[PDB]
Symmetry: D2
Subunit: 230 residues, 4 copies
């Protein structure tokens, strides 16, 4: 079973398993039950910005989500990621739909990892995605090319999102993300678009065991990240 | 009077004005009396590294100081830099000797400011220093091009440091370091070599962020580290 | 008098002084008579891209000028920058109108110096009203739509003729040493040239000069804020 | 059979097959018979620096090899990389010994790819024993002194003859696209060739190939871990 650290963008509140009563960002450590959340005033059809940061000094996992000329949502939680995750990881985005649905649409994604024993580094930047985007490991329903974006869940030829969908995008190379100062910054832009009165289920940035894969039946409320609601 | 934010690498305990009784790091917000500090087992004649970090999400100004295969010292303080400094700053290193002295030798320095409204960026890297290093503003006793290093304080033609010295290096361009921001952030690193014949060296190195038009105050040698008008 | 290396987005054919008959890109080495040019189908009112590059191994100053979904214009030229420019320089953008006019809005500017390692990078995506890390010379202003207008624009948003302005980055840039294994720079910028005139004038240039460089008195029109005369 | 573009640090003159009469650097386009070479005074037991660069505007593959306080060696050649290599590639270092031998230890390695923007950068300043973001192939090991040993070294530190290894970075790299205003890469690395032989052999190269690229069976000695034969 995979070991998951994730920052979630949770559009659909599953109160029966812990979610607050509103859309919300939060920090997920080994569980879909967030260890901390904030209210996230999601904006249908609006392109948004997510930034995630962590360093081995403060060991504060932190993230912002915003739309232009609006109040951001902010969440942060103390984690020694070197204690929780393995030496090598992969970095990625995940998303899912259920009974309810939305487009889970990635217009850009960037990452920068620095380790200082002295310094090793990795950086990659996606402002567009192509149909055969060979430096991404695409899993589940994830495609690229159309147009020219990364789409995590299923969406029709005219742009209409489909329920009970799950997909992930992992950058191809593993990342050394702690050694016995270190830091990483992740940035992405997303476009959640839904005809439903309630959209679902949300996007996530995650860091996993190198050989992580979507768990069986992880559509909907489990975001492509988790075996179960535990 | 200049508005100073600083990370200090304090070699000489001046306990008459607040210092703990050991070499320490600390965070300096508008005062030479640190808001917080930690024990910095300084190593004489050893080349060490310093890394300073800050962001507008956590607003926690933090710094590490370390010598190869040894324990680093750590210090961090919660600070909304937008609330203390002006929009435009300049960023710098400073150092000072007094009765006691040391080489305050800079072997490398780097900086990265990111501000996201979207992104504006600033980076500069110094692995060596020429004699006419036109992108620094040298104040007081600071020279460049001996080895290819920045020397914040006075040192002889054969490398021997001198008492009652004070000097500063500042990068030429001013820096946007907060907007009214999705996220802002900066990282600063430098490598130093402190070397002294004294049994106690003094007074320390600082990394500093100031009003653009800041300079060394009158008589800020010693415990005042080139940064502060007074011991208040 | 200044030492100027410039790449020029020349919108107005001043054939009297060697311009081709059409709008051109061009490389400018101590003279407004470009040492080399190529043809640039400048699209009026379109945001374009430009990239400028050089290394001390090949010593080829090169430039691309582009509009989404159309063929780029390309120009390149062999010059030892160290034998022309002084050890320290400043970097900038310049623009001029004359009898005819155009807006010279800049939407973005970037730069990277490597000297081999010493390094320098700034990215401007948007410009504030008090953009303190830029030296503004002449008619140049910042803040309006968050951009850099090199030349004067009225409050109707329309361009005034016979104007000249420049933005230089505040920090001096070390652009060659005698002891370099490699040295290199990249410069990139986006612009927008909006003219109600039949023929817009006069163009944009990215430039590297002596640190103390200033707008040559009279440098409007064909002279692009760079050169005192047309020699 | 693999598609190979390489810049070769050729320590041994295999004159039988077009090597010059001295150690050289050189650009290898689908052949071990370098298209272009320059003389390189390789210094035994000393750390050196190699820089490799290309952009799609100039279409000029150039390379610099240097030692502190000695004249650099320089080589350069005109190739439209996109007419040679496929859309996607992997990047790497290769090395070989044959009858005579040298250590081929890499102290650091960097790379930057820019596609107009899509980008990729990695910096290796040190190599742990389980360096999972490198594909190791043949005799190559990591960790010992925190370094990358392309070829076999004994437990006394001595270089073994007739050896071959390669380090490819694990992520595919997109090194051209038909819709590129500008694409470019740079690669830097530091090496240390230590040989007790009168004549060290065979050399190090930085290479770009088809993503599925493998060591050619028998590619030791003069063939650098890159080419099936000397054709
Ligand atoms: O602004 C365009 C040009 O206007 C003026 O020249 C007009 C002209 C061209 N041929 N005959 N008259 C001058 O100001 C030039 O310097 C400008 O380039
Ligand atoms: O290792 C150096 C070379 O050794 C072998 O060739 C020996 C030789 C050359 N001329 N006469 N004998 C082969 O393995 C070559 O491929 C190597 O370059
Ligand atoms: Ca949910
Ligand atoms: Ca003190
Ligand atoms: Ca160290
Ligand atoms: Ca003209
Ligand atoms: Ca374009
Ligand atoms: Ca050979
Ligand atoms: Mn949730
Ligand atoms: Mn103190
Ligand atoms: Mn012209
Ligand atoms: Mn050869």
């Amino acid at each position: 079973a995979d070991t998951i650290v994730a920052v979630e963008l949770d559009t659909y509140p599953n109160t029966d398993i812990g979610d607050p009563s509103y859309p919300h960002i939060g920090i997920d450590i080994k569980s879909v039950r967030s260890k901390k959340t904030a209210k996230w005033n999601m904006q249908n059809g609006k392109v948004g910005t997510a930034h995630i940061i962590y360093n081995s000094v403060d060991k504060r996992l932190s993230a912002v989500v915003s739309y232009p000329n609006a109040d951001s949502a902010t969440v942060s939680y103390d984690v020694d990621l070197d204690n929780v995750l393995p030496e090598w990881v992969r970095v990625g985005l995940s998303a899912s739909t259920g009974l309810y649905k939305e487009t889970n649409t990635i217009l850009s994604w960037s990452f920068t990892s620095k380790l200082k024993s002295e310094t090793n580094a990795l950086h990659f930047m996606f402002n567009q995605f192509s149909k055969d985007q060979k430096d991404l490991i695409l899993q589940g329903d994830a495609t690229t090319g159309t147009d020219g974006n990364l789409e995590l869940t299923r969406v029709s030829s005219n742009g209409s999102p489909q329920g009970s969908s799950v997909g992930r995008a992992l950058f191809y190379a593993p990342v050394h993300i702690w050694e016995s100062v270190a830091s990483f910054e992740a940035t992405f832009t997303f476009l959640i678009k839904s005809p439903d009165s309630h959209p679902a289920d949300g996007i996530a940035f995650f860091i996993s065991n190198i050989d992580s894969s979507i768990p069986s039946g992880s559509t909907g409320r489990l975001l492509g990240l988790f075996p179960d609601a535990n």
